[PDB]
Amino acid sequence: GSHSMRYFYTAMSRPGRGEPRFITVGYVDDTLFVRFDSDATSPRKEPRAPWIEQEGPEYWDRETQISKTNTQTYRENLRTALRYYNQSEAGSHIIQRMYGCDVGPDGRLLRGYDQDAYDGKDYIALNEDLSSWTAADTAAQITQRKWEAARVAEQLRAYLEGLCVESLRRYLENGKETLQRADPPKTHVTHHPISDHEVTLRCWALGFYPAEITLTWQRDGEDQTQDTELVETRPAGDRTFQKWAAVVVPSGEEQRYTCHVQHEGLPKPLTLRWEP
Amino acid sequence: IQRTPKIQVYSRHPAENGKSNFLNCYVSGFHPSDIEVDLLKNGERIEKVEHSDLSFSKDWSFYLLYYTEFTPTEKDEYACRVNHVTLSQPKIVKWDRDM
Amino acid sequence: EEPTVIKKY
* Helix (H/G/I), strand (E/B), else coil: A37: strand
Task: Choose the mutation target among C1, C4, C6, C8 for the interface with A, i.e. most A CBs under 10 Å.
Answer: C1
Nearest residue of B to residue A189, measured between CA atoms: B98
Q: Which residue of B has its CA nearest to A114?
A: B58
Calculate Rg over the CA atoms of chain B.
Answer: 14
Examine the domain organization and report whether A59 and A176 are in the same domain: yes
User: Are B17 and B72 contacting, i.e. CB atoms less than 8 angstroms apart?
Assistant: yes
The number of domains in chain A is 2
Q: Please report the number of interchain residue pairs, chain A to chain B, with beta-carbon separation below 8 angstroms.
A: 62
Task: Show residues of chain B in contact with A10, CB under 8 Å.
Answer: 33, 54, 56
Q: What are phi and psi of A163, to 5 degrees?
A: -55, -45
Q: Look up the CATH number of the domain holding residue A207.
A: 2.60.40.10
Q: Which residues contact C2 (CB under 8 A, 6 or more apart)?
A: A7, A24, A26, A63, A66, A67
Domain-terminating residue out of A181, A207, A231: A181
* B60 and B48 Cβ atoms separated by less than 8 Å: no
A196 and A168 housed in the same domain: no
In chain C, how long is the greatest CA-to-CA distance? 23
A91 HSE (CA, 13 A, CB side): 12
Q: How many CB atoms lie within 10 A of CB A76?
A: 14
Contact A240/A183 with Cβ under 8 angstroms? yes
Instruction: Determine whether the interchain pair C8/A163 forms a contact, defined as Cβ–Cβ distance below 8 Å.
Output: no
Q: Residues of C numbered 1-9 whose beta carbons fall under 8 angstroms of chain A's beta carbons: which are they? A: 1-9
Cite the DSSP H helix spans in chain A. Answer: 57-84, 138-149, 152-161, 163-174, 176-179
What is the three-state SS of A76-143? HHHHHHHHHCCCCCCCCCEEEEEEEEEECCCCCEEEEEEEEEECCEEEEEECCCCCCEEECCHHHHHH
Q: Which of A143, A158, A163 sits opposite C9 (nearest CB)?
A: A143
Residues spanned by the domain of A177: 1-181
**C-alpha span between A37 and A95 (Å, rounded):** 15
Task: Give the long-range contacts of residues A15-23, CB within 8 A, separation 24 or more.
Answer: A15/A89, A15/A90, A15/A91, A15/A92, A19/A75, A20/A74, A20/A75, A20/A78, A22/A67, A22/A70, A22/A71, A22/A74, A22/A75, A23/B53, A23/B54
Residue B85 and residue B4: Cα distance in Å, rounded?
8
Q: What does the alpha-carbon distance between residue A40 and residue A46 come to, in Å, rounded to a whole number?
A: 10
Alpha-carbon gap, residue C4 to A210, rounded angstroms: 30
Judgement on whether residues A175 and A194 belong to the same structural domain of the protein: no
Put simply, whether B22 touches A (Cβ < 8 Å) is yes
C6/chain A closest Cα distance in angstroms? 7
Residue of C nearest to A80 (CA): C9
| Final residue in a domain of this structure, among A133, A166, A181 | A181
Do A176 and A257 lie in one domain? The reply is no
Query: Looking at the partner chain, which of C1, C2, C5 has a beta carbon nearest the beta carbon of A152?
Result: C5
Among residues B99, B87, B97, which one has the least CA distance to residue B37?
A: B87
A with B: 3 or more CB pairs under 8 Å? Answer: yes
The reply to whether residue A117 touches residue B28, judged by beta carbons under 8 angstroms, is no
Same domain, A76 and A155: yes
Indicate the burial class of A44 (C-beta count within 10 angstroms; 0-12, 13-18, 19 or more): middle
Give the minimum alpha-carbon distance from C7 to chain A in angstroms, rounded to a whole number: 7
Q: Within this chain, do residues A148 and A212 fall inside the same structural domain, yes or no?
A: no
Please say whether the beta carbons of A236 and A206 come within 8 A: yes
Task: Label residues B23-42 b or e (16+ Cβ within 10 Å = b).
Answer: bbbbbbbbbbbebebbbbbe
Q: What is each CA distance from B19 to A38, B15, B22, B70, in whole angstroms?
A: 39, 8, 10, 9
User: A173 CB contacts (<8 Å, ≥6 apart)?
Assistant: none
User: Nearest C-alpha of chain C: how many angstroms from A269?
Assistant: 36
Selected residues 111-130 of chain A with any CB under 8 Å from a CB in chain C:
116
**For residues B77 and B42, what is the distance between their CA atoms, to the nearest angstrom?**
5
> Are both A171 and A220 inside the same structural domain?
no
Return the bridge partners of A125, or none: A115, A134
Planar angle of CA A232, A219, A255, nearest 5 degrees? 105
What chain A residue is nearest to B22 in terms of C-alpha separation? A237
* Shortest Cα–Cα distance, A269 to chain B (Å): 24
Cβ-defined contact of A25 to B3 (cutoff 8 Å): no
Cβ distance of B12 and A236 shorter than 8 Å: yes
- CA-nearest residue of chain A to C4? A66
Residue A270 contacts by C-beta under 8 Å, 6 or more apart in sequence? A187, A259, A260, A261, A262
Instruction: Report yes or no: B31 at the A interface, CB cutoff 8 Å.
Output: yes
Terminal-to-terminal C-alpha distance of chain C: 23
Pairing of strands A121-126, A3-12: unpaired
Quick check: B67 and B23 in contact, CB under 8 A?
yes
Q: Do C9 and A156 touch (CB under 8 A)?
A: no
Output the CA–CA distances (angstroms, integers) from residue B62 to A179, A203, B27, B81, in the order listed.
24, 27, 8, 17
* Residues on chain A bordering chain B, Cβ-to-Cβ distance under 8 angstroms: 8, 10, 12, 23, 25, 27, 32, 35, 48, 92, 94, 96, 98, 117, 119-121, 190, 192, 202, 206, 231-232, 234-238, 242
DSSP code for B7: E
The last residue of a domain, from among A114, A146, A181: A181
Here the CATH number for the domain that contains residue A133 is: 3.30.500.10
In the CATH scheme, what is the code of domain B1-99? Answer: 2.60.40.10
Q: Are residues A25 and A112 in the same domain?
A: yes
Report how far Cα A225 is from the mean position of its chain's Cα atoms.
25
Is A32 found in the same domain as A164?
A: yes
* Residue A273 backbone phi and psi in degrees, to 5: -140, 180
What is residue A269's DSSP assignment?
-
List chains touching B (3+ CB pairs under 8 A).
A
List the resolution, Å: 2.4
Q: A114: exposed, middle or buried (C-beta count within 10 Å: 0-12, 13-18, 19+)?
A: buried
